[PDB]
Design an enzyme around this catalytic site. Structure first.
Site, PDB file in Angstrom:
ATOM      1  N   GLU A  53       0.810  -1.197   0.000  1.00 34.51           N
ATOM      2  CA  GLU A  53       0.000   0.000   0.000  1.00 34.51           C
ATOM      3  C   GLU A  53       0.856   1.265   0.000  1.00 34.51           C
ATOM      4  OE1 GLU A  53      -2.997   0.340  -0.672  1.00 34.51           O
ATOM      5  OE2 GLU A  53      -3.929  -1.608  -0.248  1.00 34.51           O
ATOM      6  N   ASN A  83      -7.602   8.553  -5.986  1.00 30.54           N
ATOM      7  CA  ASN A  83      -8.295   7.506  -6.733  1.00 30.54           C
ATOM      8  C   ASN A  83      -9.085   8.157  -7.865  1.00 30.54           C
ATOM      9  OD1 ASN A  83      -7.528   5.419  -4.701  1.00 30.54           O
ATOM     10  ND2 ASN A  83      -9.120   6.310  -3.400  1.00 30.54           N
ATOM     11  N   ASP A 106     -12.130   7.976  -8.588  1.00 36.11           N
ATOM     12  CA  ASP A 106     -13.422   8.516  -8.162  1.00 36.11           C
ATOM     13  C   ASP A 106     -13.310   9.835  -7.424  1.00 36.11           C
ATOM     14  OD1 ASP A 106     -12.580   7.903  -5.537  1.00 36.11           O
ATOM     15  OD2 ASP A 106     -14.209   6.502  -5.203  1.00 36.11           O
ATOM     16  N   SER A 122     -11.687  10.330  -4.524  1.00 31.62           N
ATOM     17  CA  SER A 122     -11.261  10.116  -3.150  1.00 31.62           C
ATOM     18  C   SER A 122      -9.740   9.987  -3.140  1.00 31.62           C
ATOM     19  CB  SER A 122     -11.945   8.879  -2.618  1.00 31.62           C
ATOM     20  OG  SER A 122     -11.419   7.736  -3.223  1.00 31.62           O
ATOM     21  N   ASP A 137      -6.360   8.139  -0.790  1.00 32.65           N
ATOM     22  CA  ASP A 137      -5.947   7.103   0.164  1.00 32.65           C
ATOM     23  C   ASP A 137      -4.729   7.636   0.925  1.00 32.65           C
ATOM     24  OD1 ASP A 137      -7.812   5.265  -0.822  1.00 32.65           O
ATOM     25  OD2 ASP A 137      -6.262   4.010  -1.757  1.00 32.65           O
ATOM     26  N   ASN A 191      -8.993   5.229   2.963  1.00 35.99           N
ATOM     27  CA  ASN A 191      -9.649   5.912   1.856  1.00 35.99           C
ATOM     28  C   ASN A 191     -10.656   6.916   2.388  1.00 35.99           C
ATOM     29  OD1 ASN A 191     -11.050   6.720  -0.391  1.00 35.99           O
ATOM     30  ND2 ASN A 191     -11.331   4.672  -1.246  1.00 35.99           N
TER      31      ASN A 191
HETATM   32 CL   LIG Z   1      -9.615   2.255   3.046  1.00 39.73          CL
END
Ligand SMILES: [Cl-]
Ligand SMILES: O=C(O)c1cccc(CN2CCN(CCCS(=O)(=O)O)CCN(Cc3cccc(C(=O)O)n3)CC2)n1
Ligand SMILES: [Cl-]
Ligand SMILES: [Cl-]
Ligand SMILES: [Cl-]
Ligand SMILES: [Cl-]
Ligand SMILES: [Cl-]
Ligand code: NA
Ligand SMILES: [Tb+3]
Ligand SMILES: [Tb+3]
Length: 129
Positions: free
Chosen positions: A35, A46, A48, A50, A52, A59
């Protein structure tokens, strides 16, 4: 902060992640590796809209507030910036809520695709834990 592998394992264990909801410590160390590459300041937007955040790429769609994810929730009741601190308390406490949801660690796409099913114990091999 960029953690070492055994350094992070130790820190996760201390905050009670080892075997949390059944997931051995090496699952969490492997997920962090893929990650964030063990970097607490990692961020990734991301598609969309959002973002992280942190060592475990938590997220903003659901778990923290960044003020720029319309329609999102803040279920860990924290600013997303708090998840970028050198001290991983906030990230671990949130991860515990995440993994307690219905899908377990599958909510971490990098865990699902790169850790699940593998010999995750190797991620704590040689660590003085
Ligand atoms: Cl998450
Ligand atoms: O599989 C599921 O979790 C699932 C299934 C159907 C409906 C729900 C309701 N969720 C929405 C779906 N989001 C799951 C998808 C997250 S992702 O993997 O796509 O990124 C998780 C966010 N939720 C956090 C939460 C906190 C406490 C309890 C529960 C719960 O009982 O679900 N959920 C809020 C409500 N969840
Ligand atoms: Cl393990
Ligand atoms: Cl928002
Ligand atoms: Cl909103
Ligand atoms: Cl810490
Ligand atoms: Cl599970
Ligand atoms: Na949010
Ligand atoms: Tb849910
Ligand atoms: Tb459901």
């Amino acid at each position: 902060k960029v953690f070492g592998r055994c350094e992070l394992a130790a820190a996760m264990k201390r905050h009670g992640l080892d075997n949390y909801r059944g997931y051995s410590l090496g699952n969490w160390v492997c997920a962090a590796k893929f990650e964030s590459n063990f970097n607490t300041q990692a961020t990734n937007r991301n598609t969309d809209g959002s973002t992280d955040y942190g060592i475990l790429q938590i997220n903003s769609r659901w778990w923290c507030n960044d003020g720029r994810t319309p329609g999102s929730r803040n279920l860990c009741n924290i600013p997303c910036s708090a998840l970028l601190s050198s001290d991983i308390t906030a990230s671990v406490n949130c991860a515990k809520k995440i993994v307690s949801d219905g899908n377990g660690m599958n909510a971490w796409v990098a865990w699902r695709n790169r850790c699940k099913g593998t010999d995750v114990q190797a991620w704590i091999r040689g660590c003085r834990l």
